[PDB]
Amino acid sequence: KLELPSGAGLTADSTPLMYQGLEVGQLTKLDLNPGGKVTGEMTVDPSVVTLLRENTRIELRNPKLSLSDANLSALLTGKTFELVPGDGEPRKEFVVVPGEKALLHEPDVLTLTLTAPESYGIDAGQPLILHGVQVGQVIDRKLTSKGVTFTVAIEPQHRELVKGDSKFVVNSRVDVKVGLDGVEFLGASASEWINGGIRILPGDKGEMKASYPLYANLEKALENSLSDLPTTTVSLSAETLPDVQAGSVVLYRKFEVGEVITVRPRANAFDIDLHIKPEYRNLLTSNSVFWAEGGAKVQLNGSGLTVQASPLSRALKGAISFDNLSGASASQRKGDKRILYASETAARAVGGQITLH
Amino acid sequence: KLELPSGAGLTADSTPLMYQGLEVGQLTKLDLNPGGKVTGEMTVDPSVVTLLRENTRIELRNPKLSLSDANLSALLTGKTFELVPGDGEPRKEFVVVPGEKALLHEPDVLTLTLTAPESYGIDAGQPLILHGVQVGQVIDRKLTSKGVTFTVAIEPQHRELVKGDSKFVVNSRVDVKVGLDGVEFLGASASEWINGGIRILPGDKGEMKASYPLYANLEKALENSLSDLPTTTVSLSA
């Protein structure tokens, strides 16, 4: 006896049970029980009755379009029951599921509910890719009020390899960043783009938690930034600086680590929010002063005219530097927070304050 | 008894009534009543007569082209009546609508007339997208003297999620802005461009007003600028 999903392409005496490509059984009855429950039953070969066991699954195969092998026999038959055996106690009734849901009902499977703020163009049947090779499959996609929650499955052979710590990257969208020295193509290959799906960045050791986030691209998984707006580490004030609206780099001893994420104008002085990396927050303390500069500063000193070997951020939107020093505590004792100075020498002006008349 | 839109691919004794993929009924009569009114009638299985109720809809399915499942049985049958049940008082006559208009006649549906200054290349059957997933469908497009007025529908499952305040963004046009530090692709993805349609930017709380505007791209919905020319705040002389 079978519990069919829907008797769509199934025939009362003409749908076979394939096993190793050979016809084993025959769907001999097809009913519509009340409640919208299509059930049928099947006569199998007595040689194969030993194979019908507890872990044995019967799933229907679609007449899928083969671009490599143009066969008319596959298109003429239609729907087809495929037998895959298992082990255990011999049973005599089965539950058939559709083609996309079939991976969930393997005897071993790894099912993960992974959340996302958007579908990102991921369909229900996209492949799931580790190291270029397909290791699993997305099963279904359900939209909630918070966002999109996917349900993915991992095949039993690859089950050992994810090891509970992993990152999940979308492969459904292309992304091109252009620059003079920075040229990169993120998110896909053209053959991978038409398949699409979710990429695993596998880790070393974990506990396999229930829910995972789905990162939008590759660098947001390495930054561990599921949200679009990063955490504001330090807040500044500045009267008039042409530096940046958002996206210049935080310099340290003229070196590019950090980012300016939020400014707001005010009638007197800006309010500026900075991002620095979590491995990197030890490099600044209470005794730290901030100063900003804007654009290509061509020095005239002697013969040299040195153009700023700059990130192209600074060429468009002027960067911000900082450094630690000795007596920067007294500048922070006054005022609510640090102040972003307009020049390097103005930020160095610390110490005892005299008055000339 | 059925009130058919037009007896185009329908056959006097060969058009079936599918339910759960199984043949239930059979279109047994097909007439052209005067006034240009095609009506027919159907003999259904007595097991399924309990399912024919007030909210029960009967709509015809086109033999749609399946790229994933190349089946010859779907192309050989043609038009096909699909039964979707409902609840209520048992009725014995129905009204069949075409395939695009079928979403309006669900027992619960959210129908919005949204205006636009241009069609923006939106066809009558484009999908309607929230958060990447299709939540509804455009029904029909009517051109007026002021502009284009669309009529969209939202499925009952997603009806709770729009919450009366939303923005409606076209996905039918691509837009590329180039710059040294500003590089962005607006309006579509290449898979979303061939589907096209209207994107929802959902809000928190509202009253679900009758008419909405259709913004041309994403930033004009965030700027809340339906018109091309913004308001002149201050005037100067130089």
Coordinates of C-alpha atoms in Angstrom, one line a residue:
Chain A
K1 CA 0.0 0.0 0.0
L2 CA 1.1 3.5 -0.9
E3 CA 0.2 6.9 0.4
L4 CA 0.7 9.1 -2.7
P5 CA 1.0 12.9 -2.6
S6 CA -1.3 13.4 -5.6
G7 CA -2.2 11.1 -8.5
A8 CA -1.1 13.5 -11.2
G9 CA 0.8 11.5 -13.8
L10 CA 0.1 8.2 -12.3
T11 CA -1.9 5.5 -14.1
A12 CA -4.1 2.7 -12.7
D13 CA -2.1 -0.1 -14.3
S14 CA 0.8 1.4 -16.1
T15 CA 3.1 3.1 -13.6
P16 CA 6.1 0.8 -12.9
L17 CA 8.4 0.3 -10.0
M18 CA 12.0 0.6 -11.2
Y19 CA 14.9 -1.0 -9.4
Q20 CA 18.4 -0.9 -11.0
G21 CA 16.6 0.3 -14.1
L22 CA 14.5 -2.9 -14.3
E23 CA 10.7 -3.1 -13.8
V24 CA 9.9 -4.7 -10.5
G25 CA 6.4 -3.7 -9.6
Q26 CA 3.2 -2.2 -11.0
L27 CA 0.8 0.4 -9.5
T28 CA -2.4 -1.6 -9.7
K29 CA -5.0 0.6 -7.9
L30 CA -5.5 4.4 -7.4
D31 CA -8.1 5.9 -5.2
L32 CA -9.2 9.3 -3.9
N33 CA -10.1 8.7 -0.2
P34 CA -12.1 11.4 1.5
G35 CA -10.2 14.3 2.9
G36 CA -8.2 14.8 -0.2
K37 CA -6.0 11.8 0.4
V38 CA -4.8 10.0 -2.7
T39 CA -3.8 6.4 -1.9
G40 CA -2.8 3.5 -4.1
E41 CA -1.4 0.1 -3.9
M42 CA 1.2 -1.9 -5.8
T43 CA 2.0 -5.5 -6.7
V44 CA 5.8 -6.2 -6.4
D45 CA 7.9 -9.0 -7.6
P46 CA 8.4 -11.8 -5.0
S47 CA 12.1 -11.7 -5.6
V48 CA 12.2 -8.1 -4.3
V49 CA 10.0 -8.6 -1.2
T50 CA 13.1 -9.1 0.8
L51 CA 14.2 -5.6 -0.1
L52 CA 11.0 -3.9 1.2
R53 CA 12.1 -3.0 4.8
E54 CA 11.9 -0.2 7.3
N55 CA 14.5 2.1 5.8
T56 CA 13.4 1.3 2.3
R57 CA 12.0 4.4 0.5
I58 CA 9.8 4.5 -2.6
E59 CA 9.9 7.9 -4.3
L60 CA 8.5 8.9 -7.7
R61 CA 10.8 10.2 -10.4
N62 CA 9.8 13.0 -12.7
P63 CA 10.5 12.6 -16.5
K64 CA 13.3 15.1 -16.2
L65 CA 14.7 16.8 -19.2
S66 CA 18.1 15.4 -20.1
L67 CA 20.3 17.7 -22.2
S68 CA 23.1 15.2 -22.4
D69 CA 21.1 12.1 -23.3
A70 CA 18.2 12.8 -25.6
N71 CA 16.0 9.8 -24.9
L72 CA 12.4 9.5 -26.1
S73 CA 11.7 6.6 -23.7
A74 CA 12.0 8.8 -20.7
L75 CA 9.6 11.4 -22.0
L76 CA 7.0 8.8 -23.1
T77 CA 6.7 7.0 -19.8
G78 CA 6.2 10.0 -17.5
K79 CA 6.1 9.5 -13.7
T80 CA 8.0 6.5 -12.4
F81 CA 8.3 4.9 -8.9
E82 CA 12.0 4.3 -8.0
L83 CA 12.9 1.8 -5.3
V84 CA 15.8 2.5 -3.0
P85 CA 16.3 -0.2 -0.3
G86 CA 17.2 0.0 3.4
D87 CA 17.6 -2.3 6.4
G88 CA 15.3 -3.2 9.3
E89 CA 12.0 -4.9 10.0
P90 CA 10.0 -5.8 6.9
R91 CA 7.1 -3.4 6.3
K92 CA 4.3 -3.6 3.8
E93 CA 3.1 0.0 3.5
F94 CA 5.0 3.2 2.5
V95 CA 4.6 6.9 2.2
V96 CA 5.5 8.6 -1.1
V97 CA 6.6 12.2 -1.0
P98 CA 7.1 14.6 -3.9
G99 CA 10.5 15.0 -5.7
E100 CA 11.7 18.0 -3.8
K101 CA 10.8 16.8 -0.3
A102 CA 12.4 13.3 -1.0
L103 CA 15.8 14.2 0.5
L104 CA 14.3 14.8 4.0
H105 CA 13.0 11.2 4.3
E106 CA 16.4 9.5 3.9
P107 CA 17.2 7.3 6.9
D108 CA 20.1 9.6 7.8
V109 CA 19.9 13.3 6.9
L110 CA 21.0 16.6 8.4
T111 CA 18.1 19.2 8.3
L112 CA 19.0 22.8 9.1
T113 CA 16.6 25.7 9.4
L114 CA 18.6 28.7 8.3
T115 CA 17.2 32.3 8.5
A116 CA 17.7 35.2 6.2
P117 CA 16.3 38.8 5.8
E118 CA 15.4 38.2 2.2
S119 CA 14.9 35.2 -0.2
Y120 CA 17.9 36.4 -2.3
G121 CA 16.4 34.7 -5.3
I122 CA 16.8 31.2 -3.8
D123 CA 14.2 28.8 -5.1
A124 CA 12.9 25.7 -3.3
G125 CA 15.1 23.3 -5.3
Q126 CA 18.5 25.0 -5.5
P127 CA 21.7 23.0 -5.0
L128 CA 23.8 23.4 -1.9
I129 CA 27.5 23.6 -2.5
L130 CA 30.7 22.9 -0.5
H131 CA 34.1 23.3 -2.3
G132 CA 32.4 23.4 -5.7
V133 CA 30.6 20.1 -5.4
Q134 CA 27.0 19.7 -4.5
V135 CA 26.6 18.2 -1.0
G136 CA 23.0 18.9 -0.3
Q137 CA 19.8 20.6 -1.4
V138 CA 17.5 23.3 -0.2
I139 CA 14.1 21.7 0.6
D140 CA 11.5 24.5 1.0
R141 CA 11.3 28.2 1.6
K142 CA 8.8 29.7 4.0
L143 CA 8.2 33.5 4.4
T144 CA 7.6 34.8 7.9
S145 CA 7.2 38.3 9.4
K146 CA 10.8 38.6 10.4
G147 CA 12.2 37.4 7.1
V148 CA 12.7 34.2 5.0
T149 CA 13.4 30.9 6.8
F150 CA 14.9 28.2 4.6
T151 CA 15.1 24.5 5.3
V152 CA 18.1 22.7 3.9
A153 CA 19.3 19.1 3.9
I154 CA 22.7 17.5 3.8
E155 CA 23.4 14.1 2.3
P156 CA 24.7 11.3 4.7
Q157 CA 28.1 11.1 3.0
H158 CA 28.9 14.7 3.6
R159 CA 27.3 14.8 7.1
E160 CA 30.6 14.3 8.8
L161 CA 32.3 17.2 7.0
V162 CA 30.3 20.3 8.1
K163 CA 31.2 19.7 11.8
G164 CA 28.7 22.0 13.4
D165 CA 30.5 25.3 12.7
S166 CA 30.0 26.8 9.2
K167 CA 29.0 29.9 7.3
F168 CA 26.3 30.0 4.7
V169 CA 26.8 32.2 1.7
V170 CA 24.3 33.0 -1.1
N171 CA 25.3 32.0 -4.6
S172 CA 22.2 33.3 -6.4
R173 CA 23.4 36.9 -7.0
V174 CA 26.3 38.2 -8.9
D175 CA 28.4 41.1 -7.6
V176 CA 31.1 43.1 -9.5
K177 CA 33.3 45.7 -7.8
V178 CA 35.4 47.8 -10.1
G179 CA 38.6 49.7 -9.2
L180 CA 42.0 50.6 -10.4
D181 CA 43.8 47.9 -8.4
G182 CA 40.8 46.2 -6.9
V183 CA 38.9 44.1 -9.5
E184 CA 36.9 41.2 -8.2
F185 CA 33.9 39.1 -9.0
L186 CA 31.9 37.9 -6.0
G187 CA 29.0 35.6 -5.4
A188 CA 28.9 33.2 -8.3
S189 CA 30.3 31.8 -11.5
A190 CA 28.2 31.9 -14.6
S191 CA 27.6 28.1 -14.4
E192 CA 27.0 28.4 -10.7
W193 CA 24.7 31.4 -11.2
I194 CA 22.1 29.4 -13.2
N195 CA 22.1 26.7 -10.5
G196 CA 22.3 29.2 -7.7
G197 CA 22.0 28.1 -4.1
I198 CA 23.9 28.3 -0.8
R199 CA 27.6 27.9 -0.3
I200 CA 29.1 26.4 2.9
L201 CA 32.2 27.8 4.4
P202 CA 33.1 24.9 6.7
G203 CA 34.7 25.3 10.1
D204 CA 36.7 23.1 12.4
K205 CA 34.6 22.2 15.4
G206 CA 31.1 22.9 16.7
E207 CA 28.0 21.5 18.3
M208 CA 25.5 21.8 15.3
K209 CA 23.1 24.4 16.6
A210 CA 19.5 24.5 15.3
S211 CA 19.4 27.8 13.5
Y212 CA 22.0 29.5 11.3
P213 CA 22.1 32.9 9.5
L214 CA 22.4 33.2 5.7
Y215 CA 25.0 35.8 4.8
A216 CA 24.5 37.9 1.8
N217 CA 27.9 37.4 0.2
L218 CA 31.3 36.1 1.0
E219 CA 32.9 39.0 2.8
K220 CA 29.9 39.5 5.2
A221 CA 30.4 36.0 6.4
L222 CA 34.1 36.6 7.1
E223 CA 33.4 39.9 8.8
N224 CA 30.6 38.1 10.7
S225 CA 28.3 41.0 9.9
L226 CA 24.7 39.7 9.3
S227 CA 23.4 43.2 9.8
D228 CA 24.1 45.9 7.2
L229 CA 25.2 48.5 9.7
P230 CA 28.2 47.7 11.9
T231 CA 28.7 48.5 15.5
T232 CA 29.7 52.1 16.3
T233 CA 32.9 51.6 18.4
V234 CA 33.8 55.2 19.1
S235 CA 31.8 58.4 18.6
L236 CA 33.4 61.7 17.7
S237 CA 32.6 65.4 17.3
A238 CA 34.0 67.7 14.6
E239 CA 33.1 71.3 13.7
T240 CA 33.9 71.5 10.0
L241 CA 35.5 68.5 8.2
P242 CA 35.1 67.7 4.5
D243 CA 36.2 64.1 5.2
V244 CA 33.3 61.7 4.5
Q245 CA 29.6 61.1 4.6
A246 CA 30.2 57.3 5.1
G247 CA 32.8 54.8 3.9
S248 CA 36.2 56.4 4.3
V249 CA 38.9 54.5 6.1
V250 CA 40.2 54.9 9.7
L251 CA 44.0 55.3 9.5
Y252 CA 46.5 54.4 12.1
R253 CA 50.1 55.5 11.7
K254 CA 49.0 56.1 8.1
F255 CA 47.5 52.6 7.7
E256 CA 44.0 51.5 6.6
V257 CA 42.1 49.6 9.3
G258 CA 38.6 50.8 10.2
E259 CA 35.7 52.5 8.6
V260 CA 33.5 55.6 9.1
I261 CA 29.9 54.4 9.0
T262 CA 27.7 57.3 10.1
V263 CA 27.9 61.1 10.2
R264 CA 25.2 63.6 10.8
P265 CA 25.5 67.3 10.1
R266 CA 24.5 69.8 12.8
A267 CA 24.6 73.6 12.9
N268 CA 27.7 73.6 15.1
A269 CA 29.5 70.3 14.9
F270 CA 29.2 66.9 13.3
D271 CA 28.5 63.7 15.2
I272 CA 30.6 60.9 13.7
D273 CA 30.4 57.1 14.2
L274 CA 33.3 54.8 13.5
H275 CA 33.8 51.1 13.0
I276 CA 36.9 49.2 14.0
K277 CA 37.6 45.5 13.9
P278 CA 37.0 43.3 17.0
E279 CA 40.6 41.9 16.9
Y280 CA 41.7 45.5 16.6
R281 CA 40.0 47.3 19.5
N282 CA 43.0 46.8 21.8
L283 CA 45.0 49.3 19.6
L284 CA 43.1 52.3 21.0
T285 CA 42.5 53.4 24.6
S286 CA 41.6 56.5 26.6
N287 CA 44.9 58.2 25.6
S288 CA 44.0 58.5 21.9
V289 CA 43.4 61.5 19.7
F290 CA 41.6 61.7 16.4
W291 CA 42.3 63.9 13.4
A292 CA 41.0 64.1 9.8
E293 CA 42.3 65.2 6.4
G294 CA 40.6 65.5 3.1
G295 CA 41.8 64.7 -0.5
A296 CA 45.1 64.6 -2.3
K297 CA 47.6 66.7 -0.3
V298 CA 50.4 67.4 -2.6
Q299 CA 53.4 68.6 -0.5
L300 CA 55.8 71.1 -2.0
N301 CA 58.7 70.3 0.2
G302 CA 61.9 70.9 -1.7
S303 CA 61.9 69.2 -5.1
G304 CA 59.3 66.5 -4.2
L305 CA 55.6 66.8 -5.1
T306 CA 54.3 63.7 -3.4
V307 CA 50.7 62.8 -4.4
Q308 CA 48.9 60.9 -1.6
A309 CA 49.4 57.1 -2.2
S310 CA 45.9 56.8 -0.9
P311 CA 43.0 54.4 -0.8
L312 CA 40.6 55.6 -3.5
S313 CA 38.2 56.2 -0.5
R314 CA 40.5 59.2 0.4
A315 CA 40.6 60.4 -3.2
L316 CA 36.8 60.7 -3.1
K317 CA 36.1 61.1 0.6
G318 CA 39.0 62.1 3.0
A319 CA 40.2 59.6 5.6
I320 CA 40.6 59.9 9.3
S321 CA 43.8 59.0 11.2
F322 CA 44.5 58.5 14.9
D323 CA 47.4 57.7 17.3
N324 CA 48.0 57.1 20.9
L325 CA 50.1 59.6 23.0
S326 CA 50.9 60.6 26.5
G327 CA 48.7 63.3 27.8
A328 CA 45.4 62.8 25.9
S329 CA 43.5 62.0 29.1
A330 CA 42.9 65.7 30.0
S331 CA 41.3 66.3 26.6
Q332 CA 38.8 63.5 27.4
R333 CA 38.2 64.6 31.0
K334 CA 36.7 67.8 29.6
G335 CA 33.7 67.2 27.2
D336 CA 31.4 64.2 27.0
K337 CA 33.6 62.3 24.5
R338 CA 36.5 62.7 22.1
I339 CA 36.7 65.5 19.5
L340 CA 37.8 65.1 15.9
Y341 CA 40.5 67.6 15.2
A342 CA 40.9 69.3 11.8
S343 CA 44.7 68.7 11.5
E344 CA 47.5 66.5 12.8
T345 CA 49.3 69.3 14.6
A346 CA 46.1 70.5 16.2
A347 CA 45.5 67.1 17.7
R348 CA 49.1 67.0 19.1
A349 CA 48.3 70.2 21.2
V350 CA 48.2 68.5 24.6
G351 CA 49.8 69.5 27.9
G352 CA 49.9 72.5 30.1
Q353 CA 48.1 75.5 28.8
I354 CA 49.6 79.0 29.2
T355 CA 48.4 82.4 28.0
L356 CA 50.3 85.1 26.1
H357 CA 49.3 88.7 26.2
Chain B
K1 CA -23.9 24.3 -14.5
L2 CA -20.9 26.4 -15.5
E3 CA -20.6 30.0 -16.9
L4 CA -17.5 29.7 -19.1
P5 CA -15.5 32.7 -20.3
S6 CA -15.1 31.3 -23.9
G7 CA -15.2 27.8 -25.1
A8 CA -11.8 28.0 -26.7
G9 CA -10.0 24.7 -26.0
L10 CA -13.0 23.1 -24.4
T11 CA -14.5 19.9 -25.7
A12 CA -18.1 18.7 -25.5
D13 CA -17.3 15.4 -23.8
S14 CA -13.5 15.4 -23.3
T15 CA -12.6 18.2 -20.8
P16 CA -12.1 16.7 -17.4
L17 CA -12.4 18.0 -13.8
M18 CA -9.2 17.3 -12.0
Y19 CA -9.0 17.1 -8.2
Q20 CA -5.7 16.1 -6.5
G21 CA -4.6 15.1 -10.0
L22 CA -7.4 12.6 -10.4
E23 CA -10.3 12.8 -12.9
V24 CA -13.5 13.7 -11.0
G25 CA -15.9 15.2 -13.6
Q26 CA -16.5 15.6 -17.3
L27 CA -17.7 18.6 -19.3
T28 CA -20.8 17.1 -21.0
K29 CA -22.4 20.0 -22.7
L30 CA -21.2 23.3 -24.3
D31 CA -23.6 25.9 -25.7
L32 CA -23.4 29.4 -27.1
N33 CA -26.3 31.3 -25.5
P34 CA -27.4 34.5 -27.2
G35 CA -25.6 37.7 -26.2
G36 CA -22.1 36.0 -26.6
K37 CA -22.5 34.0 -23.5
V38 CA -20.8 30.5 -23.5
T39 CA -22.3 28.3 -20.9
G40 CA -21.7 24.6 -20.2
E41 CA -22.5 21.9 -17.7
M42 CA -20.7 19.1 -16.0
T43 CA -21.4 15.7 -14.4
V44 CA -19.3 15.2 -11.3
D45 CA -18.5 12.1 -9.2
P46 CA -21.0 11.6 -6.4
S47 CA -18.1 11.2 -4.0
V48 CA -17.1 14.8 -4.7
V49 CA -20.6 16.4 -4.4
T50 CA -19.9 17.1 -0.7
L51 CA -16.9 19.3 -1.9
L52 CA -19.0 21.5 -4.1
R53 CA -19.8 24.4 -1.8
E54 CA -20.1 28.2 -1.6
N55 CA -16.4 29.0 -1.5
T56 CA -15.5 26.2 -3.9
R57 CA -14.0 27.6 -7.1
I58 CA -13.7 25.9 -10.5
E59 CA -11.0 27.4 -12.7
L60 CA -9.5 26.2 -15.9
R61 CA -5.8 25.4 -16.2
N62 CA -3.9 26.2 -19.3
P63 CA -1.5 23.5 -20.7
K64 CA 1.5 25.6 -19.5
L65 CA 5.0 25.0 -20.7
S66 CA 7.0 23.2 -18.1
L67 CA 10.8 23.7 -18.6
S68 CA 11.6 21.5 -15.6
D69 CA 9.3 18.5 -16.3
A70 CA 9.0 17.7 -20.0
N71 CA 5.7 15.9 -20.1
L72 CA 3.7 15.1 -23.3
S73 CA 0.6 14.3 -21.3
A74 CA 0.2 17.9 -20.3
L75 CA 0.5 19.2 -23.9
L76 CA -1.9 16.6 -25.4
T77 CA -4.8 17.2 -23.0
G78 CA -5.0 21.0 -23.4
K79 CA -7.5 23.0 -21.2
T80 CA -8.4 21.4 -17.9
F81 CA -10.8 22.3 -15.2
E82 CA -9.2 22.3 -11.7
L83 CA -11.3 21.9 -8.6
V84 CA -10.4 23.8 -5.4
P85 CA -12.8 23.3 -2.5
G86 CA -14.2 25.7 0.1
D87 CA -16.8 25.8 2.9
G88 CA -20.4 27.0 3.2
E89 CA -23.8 26.2 1.7
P90 CA -23.8 23.6 -1.1
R91 CA -24.3 25.2 -4.5
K92 CA -24.9 23.7 -7.9
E93 CA -23.7 26.3 -10.3
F94 CA -20.4 28.1 -10.7
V95 CA -18.7 30.9 -12.7
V96 CA -15.4 30.1 -14.4
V97 CA -13.0 33.0 -15.0
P98 CA -9.8 33.0 -17.2
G99 CA -6.4 32.1 -15.8
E100 CA -5.2 35.6 -15.0
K101 CA -8.4 36.8 -13.3
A102 CA -8.6 33.7 -11.2
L103 CA -6.8 35.1 -8.2
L104 CA -9.5 37.8 -7.6
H105 CA -12.2 35.2 -7.0
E106 CA -10.5 33.5 -4.0
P107 CA -12.7 33.6 -0.9
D108 CA -10.2 35.9 0.8
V109 CA -8.1 38.2 -1.3
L110 CA -6.6 41.7 -1.0
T111 CA -7.2 43.8 -4.1
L112 CA -5.4 47.1 -4.5
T113 CA -5.8 49.7 -7.3
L114 CA -2.3 51.3 -7.6
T115 CA -1.7 54.2 -9.9
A116 CA 1.4 55.1 -12.0
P117 CA 2.4 57.7 -14.6
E118 CA 3.5 55.0 -17.0
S119 CA 3.1 51.2 -17.5
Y120 CA 6.9 50.8 -16.9
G121 CA 6.7 47.6 -18.9
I122 CA 4.5 45.8 -16.5
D123 CA 2.3 43.2 -18.2
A124 CA -1.0 41.9 -16.9
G125 CA 0.4 38.7 -15.4
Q126 CA 3.6 39.8 -13.7
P127 CA 4.5 38.4 -10.3
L128 CA 4.4 40.6 -7.2
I129 CA 7.3 40.2 -4.8
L130 CA 8.0 40.8 -1.1
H131 CA 11.4 39.9 0.2
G132 CA 12.3 37.9 -2.9
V133 CA 9.3 35.5 -2.7
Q134 CA 6.2 35.9 -4.8
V135 CA 3.3 36.9 -2.6
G136 CA 0.7 38.1 -5.1
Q137 CA 0.1 38.8 -8.7
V138 CA -0.9 41.8 -10.9
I139 CA -4.3 41.1 -12.4
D140 CA -5.0 43.6 -15.1
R141 CA -3.7 46.9 -16.5
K142 CA -6.0 49.7 -17.6
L143 CA -4.8 53.0 -19.2
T144 CA -6.6 56.2 -18.3
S145 CA -6.0 59.8 -19.3
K146 CA -4.0 60.6 -16.1
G147 CA -1.8 57.5 -16.5
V148 CA -1.8 53.8 -15.9
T149 CA -3.9 52.2 -13.1
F150 CA -3.0 48.7 -12.2
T151 CA -5.0 46.2 -10.1
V152 CA -3.0 43.8 -8.0
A153 CA -4.0 41.0 -5.7
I154 CA -2.4 39.5 -2.6
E155 CA -2.7 35.9 -1.5
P156 CA -4.5 35.1 1.8
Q157 CA -1.4 33.8 3.5
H158 CA 0.5 37.0 3.0
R159 CA -2.5 39.3 3.7
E160 CA -1.4 39.8 7.3
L161 CA 2.1 41.0 6.4
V162 CA 1.6 44.1 4.3
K163 CA -0.2 45.9 7.2
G164 CA -1.6 48.8 5.3
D165 CA 1.6 50.8 4.9
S166 CA 3.9 49.9 2.1
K167 CA 5.8 51.2 -0.9
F168 CA 5.4 49.7 -4.4
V169 CA 8.6 49.6 -6.5
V170 CA 8.8 48.6 -10.2
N171 CA 11.1 45.6 -10.9
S172 CA 10.6 45.6 -14.7
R173 CA 13.4 48.0 -15.6
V174 CA 17.2 47.8 -15.0
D175 CA 19.2 50.8 -13.9
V176 CA 23.0 51.1 -13.8
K177 CA 24.7 54.1 -12.1
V178 CA 28.5 54.2 -12.7
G179 CA 31.0 56.2 -10.6
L180 CA 34.5 56.0 -9.1
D181 CA 33.2 55.0 -5.6
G182 CA 29.5 54.7 -6.4
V183 CA 28.7 51.5 -8.3
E184 CA 25.2 50.1 -7.9
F185 CA 22.7 48.1 -9.8
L186 CA 19.1 49.1 -9.1
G187 CA 15.7 47.8 -10.0
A188 CA 16.2 44.1 -10.8
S189 CA 18.2 41.0 -10.9
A190 CA 18.6 39.2 -14.2
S191 CA 16.3 36.4 -13.1
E192 CA 13.9 38.9 -11.6
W193 CA 14.1 41.1 -14.7
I194 CA 12.5 38.4 -17.0
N195 CA 9.7 37.9 -14.4
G196 CA 9.5 41.6 -13.7
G197 CA 6.7 42.9 -11.6
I198 CA 6.2 45.1 -8.5
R199 CA 8.2 44.9 -5.3
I200 CA 6.7 45.6 -1.8
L201 CA 8.6 47.7 0.7
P202 CA 6.5 46.7 3.8
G203 CA 5.9 49.1 6.7
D204 CA 4.8 48.7 10.3
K205 CA 1.3 49.9 10.7
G206 CA -1.5 51.4 8.5
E207 CA -5.1 51.5 7.6
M208 CA -5.0 49.9 4.1
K209 CA -6.1 52.8 1.9
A210 CA -7.7 52.2 -1.5
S211 CA -5.2 53.7 -3.9
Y212 CA -1.4 53.6 -3.8
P213 CA 1.3 55.1 -6.0
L214 CA 3.8 53.0 -8.0
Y215 CA 7.3 54.4 -7.5
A216 CA 9.7 54.2 -10.5
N217 CA 12.7 52.7 -8.6
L218 CA 13.8 52.0 -5.1
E219 CA 15.3 55.4 -4.1
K220 CA 12.2 57.4 -5.2
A221 CA 10.1 55.3 -2.8
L222 CA 12.5 56.1 0.1
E223 CA 12.7 59.8 -0.8
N224 CA 8.8 59.6 -1.1
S225 CA 9.1 61.5 -4.4
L226 CA 6.5 60.3 -6.8
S227 CA 7.0 63.4 -9.0
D228 CA 10.2 63.9 -10.9
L229 CA 10.8 67.4 -9.8
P230 CA 11.2 68.0 -6.1
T231 CA 9.8 70.9 -4.0
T232 CA 11.8 74.1 -4.2
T233 CA 12.5 74.9 -0.6
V234 CA 14.4 78.1 -1.0
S235 CA 14.9 80.4 -4.0
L236 CA 18.1 82.4 -4.6
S237 CA 19.5 85.1 -6.9
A238 CA 23.0 85.2 -8.2

